[PDB]
Amino acid sequence: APGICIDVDNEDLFFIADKNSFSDDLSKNERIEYNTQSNYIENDFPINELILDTDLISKIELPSENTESLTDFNVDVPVYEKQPAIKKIFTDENTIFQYLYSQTFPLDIRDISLTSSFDDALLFSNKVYSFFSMDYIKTANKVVEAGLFAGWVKQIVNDFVIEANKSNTMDKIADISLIVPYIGLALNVGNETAKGNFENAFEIAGASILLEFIPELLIPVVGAFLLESYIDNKNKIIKTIDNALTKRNEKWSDMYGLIVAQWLSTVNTQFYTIKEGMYKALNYQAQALEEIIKYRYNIYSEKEKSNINIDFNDINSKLNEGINQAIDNINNFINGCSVSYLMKKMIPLAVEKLLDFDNTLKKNLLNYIDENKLYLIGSAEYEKSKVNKYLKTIMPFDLSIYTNDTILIEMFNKYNSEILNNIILNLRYKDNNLIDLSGYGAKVEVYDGVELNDKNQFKLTSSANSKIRVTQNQNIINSVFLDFSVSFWIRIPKYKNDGIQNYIHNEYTIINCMKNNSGWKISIRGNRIIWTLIDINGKTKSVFFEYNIREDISEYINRWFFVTITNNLNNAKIYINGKLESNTDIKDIREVIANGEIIFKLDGDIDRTQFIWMKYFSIFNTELSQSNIEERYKIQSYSEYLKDFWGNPLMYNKEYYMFNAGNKNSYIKLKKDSPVGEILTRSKYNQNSKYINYRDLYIGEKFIIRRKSNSQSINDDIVRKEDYIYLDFFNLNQEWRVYTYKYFKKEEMKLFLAPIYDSDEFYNTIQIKEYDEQPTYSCQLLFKKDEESTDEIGLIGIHRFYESGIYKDYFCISKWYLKEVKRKPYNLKLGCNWQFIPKDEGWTE
């Protein structure tokens, strides 16, 4: 009788209510009349009212118990019988039950070891499956000397606690608040969550991937209303119209309650079983470690035990607090997933059918007003506007209507307090394409003319096929009372000097969301970015942001910046890089249609070489606060790598002109017949116009960054923080290098620029830095003696040197900068702050 067979209690299985459990009554018709009332039954009753109700207990005395004998014994006696206690089945699946079995071991076995192979744990008695990291497994499996043991015991216990407490995403820009990333490996529950990277799979598909079963919902087509004729009475016709609208609300509420009942008995049940699984999985992993520790302690000789101080109750106690911390995280994560499935995968499907019912009722009610217009005596038109006003605003879902359980209310209130759950469209790059990671499943189709890269940047060109079409989910809930935000990053190219008039006057649309000549629009006119609202009547409001085109150095022109647009009752606002720039009042407008197709396309009287870059386009169904936007600005600014002047990633083996944030109109030139950096002044814009001014950027020596050692990750050519590098530059044909002199007696000293040669009195090793904690494209350059040494010589910068005559600025190293870089606010205008400028298509001069 071979084959691995696991005995599973019926108790540990998933309770999933059949579709036949739920009522179909919402499909029946209602007859509406002058005196028709609403039907609600609250499942509550106050206990204090029950305890002090004088009417509850009977005042009437109990009649005598004695009576005539029973002679009619007729009665139905139920009959019971037993059934078998085992049912044998064969399955290909390896889910929760199978994965937990792999984490146990028999009582009599000695010398267990941990493994990441599920199949080996099943085959071999001494192998126990584990879902923690490769490093934990290896450290748990290590055998050591007696003197090192108590150190190893302290370490692996601590490592257990750390591994259990992992509660964050590795990708920091992903829009995910809480996650426990080892859940997939622990149970393989749902759609193969042990295979592949679980955190990655969760970002794409959400809570759905943990469900072992996707239930089939009952969502009935709400029945017709049959309004009564009262040809005599005006009063009763208006009451019938009022009773129709009031009964429409009952049908919304009952539909929501039908969805909540299915949620709790088919989805929230599954997530409960998952929480119980993780509790057991975690306890098995602690039991395995306690068995490994105990076994290895007893291999040592009896005298070696008295050189090793171990407390086994302390170990059990310390692992248990680690489990209890982990269970808190898991309960929060899973509770969040359950509410998420309710709000994204169930509620909207009900709303689809309820809007369809509202539509059929509106047609019915208006025809009823029209049939009775004579008996309404010209009040008719007041009733038609009441009907259209009442059926415009839809009933919002509130779980607290359908339950008084505080655990469920707090789940729901936590969900609504987390701003990431307000995202309704979130365009991101996966597998050479753009997709929606919001969870609402919007359709996205990118045509061939849009260039994409894996840094989430997309390019809209003037070509006809450079287009994206997003089709929004129609079942998300804000027509009249706007409450929504839009955010994205953008890099807008510089004007052409010859064609300044086409630039400054010709407005062109980039993103267009319109239906029946109503919606919203993002457009650009030269150095102005514009947000526009358009209502059903054709009315217009705008708010804009304009950046200065007469600036020595612009922070906006052809450089990546962050835009956020916010809309409520009063205002439409534009924020740039987290700060409020503009504000327009929008009360005058009424009813904007935001459910249209979104078209990403250049449209207008444009130059044929015009283009736009964009990144991280997303839409929120609420008005983002200043904090939310500033937080989002910082999060989307994060990288392991450094950035160049334009905001793109900084690269090895790329030609760069150097810029200094403290001396902005300055540049490095190699001095005539001398090996030092001479500092000149930048040549400004030559001639003509009046509207334009800038300073030349492609000027000074052409630098280039070179990596020190080949023994590293040679996958990409991207410069990261704390990397060791040589700073080189071109001199006619050859490549020269930047050095510092090993003797450095004064505070500031000129730098030695010479060809590539191994000298003995000059250091060449630079460490590239980023001392600024806020977002920036400025980096710093630190000289040391060599890589291993913890002493730091000084930072590269600029100083005004005195040299006698019988003052001039030089490219230097300085000690004074190291005493300033760690001050609280951080000086952006420090002379050690450099930025690298490559030659870019969107800046010509």
């Binding site: 001398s674 090996p675 030092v676 000293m749 000129k750 010479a754 006698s804």
Partner: peptide
């Protein structure tokens, strides 16, 4: 050719003491 490096080095050592 190494003496191109030495002739630059003295010009730096001059520029330093300047």
């Amino acid at each position: 050719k190494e003496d191109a490096f030495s002739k630059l080095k003295e010009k730096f050592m001059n520029e330093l003491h300047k």
